[PDB]
């Protein structure tokens, strides 16, 4: 492969600059409970990982929005008490299998 450099747009999950209203519509239209996505944060740096999901007792699923905090060593992580290599290097882990309180990504969404 080795096709692409520091390019986030490459991946699919990475939706990029998207309006809170869009992320939802795009996450809903898909019609796949568990679908996830990654959009740019208000300020250059952090990242907002939103994903759709449903529960046992619920009429309409609720869209969740996670934030990526930066550590002193510029370490990126979505769940407290955990550190990863990078944004795109993290999904690889979760996607395959969740880590903590982060829903198990079912499929990428743009």
Curated annotation (Swiss-Prot):
Signal peptide: none
TM regions (residue ranges): none
Post-translational modification: Phosphorylated in response to protein I/II and to LPS.
Domain SH2: 13-109
Regulation: induction: Activated by IL6/interleukin-6 through phosphatidylinositol 3-kinase (PI3-kinase) pathway. It is likely that activation occurs through binding of phosphoinositides to the PH domain.
Tissue expression from the record: Highly expressed in cells with great migratory potential, including endothelial cells and metastatic carcinoma cell lines.
Localization terms from the record: Cytoplasm
Functional note: Non-receptor tyrosine kinase that plays central but diverse modulatory roles in various signaling processes involved in the regulation of actin reorganization, cell migration, cell proliferation and survival, cell adhesion, and apoptosis. Participates in signal transduction stimulated by growth factor receptors, cytokine receptors, G-protein coupled receptors, antigen receptors and integrins. Induces tyrosine phosphorylation of BCAR1 in response to integrin regulation.
Quaternary context: Interacts with BCAR1, CAV1, MYD88, PTK2/FAK1, RUFY1, RUFY2, STAT3, TIRAP and TNFRSF1B.
Family: Belongs to the protein kinase superfamily. Tyr protein kinase family. TEC subfamily.
Domain commentary: SH2 domain mediates interaction with RUFY1.
Protein name stated in the entry: Cytoplasmic tyrosine-protein kinase BMX
Name of the encoding gene: BMX
Residues of the full protein shown: 291 to 393 of 675
């Amino acid at each position: 492969g080795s096709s692409g450099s520091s390019g986030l747009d490459d991946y699919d999950w990475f939706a990029g600059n998207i309006s809170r209203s869009q992320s939802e519509q795009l996450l809903r239209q898909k019609g796949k409970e568990g679908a996830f996505m990654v959009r740019n944060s208000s300020q250059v740096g952090m990242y907002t990982v939103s994903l759709f999901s449903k529960a046992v007792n619920d009429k309409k699923g609720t869209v969740k929005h996670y934030h990526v905090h930066t550590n002193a060593e510029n370490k990126l992580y979505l769940a407290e008490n955990y550190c990863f290599d990078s944004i795109p290097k993290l999904i690889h882990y979760h996607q395959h299998n969740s880590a903590g309180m982060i829903t198990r990504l079912r499929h990428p969404v743009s």
